[PDB]
C-alpha cells in the first residue's frame, strides 16, 4: 500500500534514549522508514529547546494534505545544518527511535510509504 495507518507514541524529549537515526540525510530517512515499518518509531513534539536536545540530521513528519479515519496524512522531511530534503506541510513532530520509553500520547498518522 502507498499509505500505512500508524499510531506513533509521543515521547518527552528528556526521556529519549536514542536521540536520532544516524549520521547522513539518506541514513536517517532510511532508518526512520524502517522503524516506522517495525513499530519502533517515536514522535517528539517540536517546541522551544527540543531540537538542540536531539541529534542532526533530524527526520520530521509533515502534514502532506488536509485526515482519513482520524489519521493525518504525513510524509518524511530530513534536515541537516538548516537545509531540508523534501518539501511538505506543517511539522507534527520529530521522529526518533523508540526503545521502550513511556509515551504521553499517541499521534494517529497515515504515512506516505
Swiss-Prot record:
Signal peptide as annotated in the record: none
Gene of this entry: rep
Subcellular compartments: Host cytoplasm
Region (Disordered): 1-113
Domain of life the protein comes from: Viruses
Protein's job: Inhibits host translation by associating with the open head conformation of the 40S subunit. The C-terminus binds to and obstructs ribosomal mRNA entry tunnel. Thereby inhibits antiviral response triggered by innate immunity or interferons. The nsp1-40S ribosome complex further induces an endonucleolytic cleavage near the 5'UTR of host mRNAs, targeting them for degradation. This inhibits the integrated stress response (ISR) in the infected cell by preventing EIF2S1/eIF2-alpha phosphorylation upstream of stress granule formation and depletes host G3BP1.
Protein name: Host translation inhibitor nsp1
Upper classification of the organism: Viruses, Riboviria, Orthornavirae, Pisuviricota, Pisoniviricetes
Effect of substituting residue 37 to R: In strain: Omicron/XBB.1.5, Omicron/EG.5.1
Amino acid at each position: 500500500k502507498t499509505h500505512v495507518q500508524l499510531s506513533l507514541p509521543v515521547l518527552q524529549v528528556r526521556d529519549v534514549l536514542v536521540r536520532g537515526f544516524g549520521d547522513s540525510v539518506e541514513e536517517v530517512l532510511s532508518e526512520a522508514r524502517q522503524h516506522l515499518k517495525d513499530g519502533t518509531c517515536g514522535l517528539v513534539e517540536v517546541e522551544k529547546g527540543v531540537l538542540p536536545q536531539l541529534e542532526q540530521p533530524y527526520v520530521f513528519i509533515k502534514r502532506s494534505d488536509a485526515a482519513p479515519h482520524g489519521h493525518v496524512m504525513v510524509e518524511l522531511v530530513a534536515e541537516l545544518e538548516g537545509i531540508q530534503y523534501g518539501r511538505s506541510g506543517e511539522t507534527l513532530g520529530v521522529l526518533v527511535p523508540h526503545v521502550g520509553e513511556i509515551p504521553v500520547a499517541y499521534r494517529k498518522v497515515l504515512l506516505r510509504k
